[PDB]
Design a protein around this nucleic acid. Structure first.
Length: 106
DNA sequence: CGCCGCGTCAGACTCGTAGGATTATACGACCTTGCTTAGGATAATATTAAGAAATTAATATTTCT
């Protein structure tokens, strides 16, 4: 409840185009079908959709999926975004060099 | 021999300490210089595939216990 009221502005459903995300139920809906999303990809997608339209920093994402203790040594955020874009479509997740990524609303 | 009159130069020491020197001022015209636009060609350079394989972290047996 807390997380939802603060970040998702109180709403239980994020509606961006054909993407619909129930953050409380952990459910992602491409159009009307359901998607099998790994934990990490779910976290990334959650964050991008909550801050709809506005690019999120790379470091914000890196913290958001990676617990302080287990921090890897190589390219992971990029691969996770790649698979998120493969399961969702290259159009949704636009790349903003230097300052992370952005989910397009328009 | 015994002045004698010219410059001449540092004169003890610790604390803080405001205002300070006018006059009267030509136009072009090259020529150069010292800094700014600008316009693409590359060159880094940040990211994206990709896959593949390698753990590796979970899922689901099944065998003990």
């Amino acid at each position: 409840a807390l997380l939802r009221r603060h970040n998702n502005q109180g709403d239980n459903e994020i509606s961006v185009g054909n993407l619909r995300l129930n953050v409380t139920r952990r459910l992602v809906w491409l159009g009307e079908t359901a998607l099998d999303l790994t934990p990490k990809e779910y976290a990334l997608l959650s964050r991008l959709m909550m801050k709809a339209g506005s690019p999120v920093h790379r470091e914000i994402l890196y913290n958001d999926i990676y617990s302080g203790d287990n921090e890897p040594a190589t390219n992971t955020l990029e691969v996770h975004i790649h698979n998120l874009r493969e399961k969702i479509g290259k159009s949704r997740i636009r790349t903003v060099r230097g300052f992370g990524y952005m989910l397009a609303n328009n």
